[PDB]
Symmetry: C3
Subunit: 129 residues, 3 copies
């Protein structure tokens, strides 16, 4: 076998997406898998990724209610040697669309470069209050 | 949606907790979820976190017996902008209490700052020998 | 309990192994657990590790077919204080043998030092074309 060392700036990302809508279990990990593939194909990027099922705990920002839910951690290692701005923008857009598609209050996105965190973002719904 | 960049020093942690007591499967991931919420509430900290079910392999330190068990990886991203000492102390205390509550020989705690590991600790029972 | 800080250079690794052979679901996480234990014992190293079940998406390199499969993320924290070359070589050998044993096109290996990525490798089959 060939031991090929990966090219580029060493970008990776983690995205956390919950599967409850408020206190109601609603979605599944496979829904997130399929939606992520579809979004990434429309970006023209290789969709390759890992999806980890989790239990998650989140405090709702408006009401303060604590929710325990199923959630998904998406792990993306860049295998295409994208620029920092290109990778970051595509991951941000993916997180923003996942938030809408799963009707979520918040999606967390972490961007790394050689494992060093460049940015942690909370993508937060602007539902009118 | 708002793309809010997270504040503070960028602290996060990972805690590994097994669910066997010796060679006996005993606990579940939901037990760890509930106990973690309870401990973190008593610390006055937001309990928000992710919990990953795993299979784990561990060599018992006294007997050398190899155990294969279910285990839990707790992933904590600090969203409250705590100081390094405050975050580290609260995570250490959480790990120490989880070790007791689940009757474990060892719990592993990793503390990161912007993804860079600051400390890896093995929290080890002092059972008399 | 004792809060023991871990010794050595702070090495860790992640290995991603799929469980499909082409488009056919074939293997299970427990198969990977058992095979990893066996390989690491023959290396003379402590086998201790974590194994995370995942859904994975991979683009086959020859045909371009997109596969969705079950997969495993192996997480290894070095608890024995190995040298960089010793740890790296043993993890590389483990990944290469897992690729063969599970008839895989590609296995991904990431090596970290204090969380900073030193190398990401794709271990790729050299099947004749
Ligand atoms: C943002 S809410 C969606 C999911 O993100 C994860 N999550 C939320 N807050 C945190 C946090 N501070 N640390 C780790 N994971 C979190 C949990 O898995 C949750 O189900
Ligand atoms: C400390 S024993 C509890 C759990 O920690 C994890 N674990 C133990 N040792 C290691 C190691 N060296 N690397 C990664 N995970 C480990 C395994 O999931 C185990 O079930
Ligand atoms: C290498 S194919 C084996 C497994 O590796 C993981 N994988 C493949 N490519 C990527 C990638 N670019 N980022 C993250 N995980 C990936 C997926 O879980 C897959 O099932
Ligand atoms: O967005 C929601 O409504 C729930 C709570 C956190 C993520 N899932
Ligand atoms: O502590 C115990 O007894 C088992 C072995 C490792 C963690 N769970
Ligand atoms: O190697 C294979 O055939 C499948 C596709 C990626 C990993 N598992
Ligand atoms: Na890939
Ligand atoms: Na949160
Ligand atoms: Na161990």
């Amino acid at each position: 076998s060939l031991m090929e060392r990966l090219g580029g700036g060493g970008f990776s990302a983690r995205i956390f997406v919950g599967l409850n809508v408020g206190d109601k279990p609603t979605y599944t990990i496979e829904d997130v898998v399929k939606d992520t593939i579809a979004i990434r194909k429309r970006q023209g990027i290789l969709p390759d990724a890992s999806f980890v099922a989790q239990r998650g705990v989140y405090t709702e920002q408006r009401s303060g209610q604590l929710v325990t839910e199923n959630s998904v951690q998406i792990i993306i290692i860049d295998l295409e040697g994208l620029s920092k701005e290109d990778f970051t923008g595509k991951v941000q857009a993916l997180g923003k669309e996942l938030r809408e598609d799963f009707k979520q209050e918040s999606v967390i996105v972490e961007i790394q470069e050689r494992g060093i965190v460049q940015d942690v973002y909370s993508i937060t719904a602007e539902w009118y209050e």
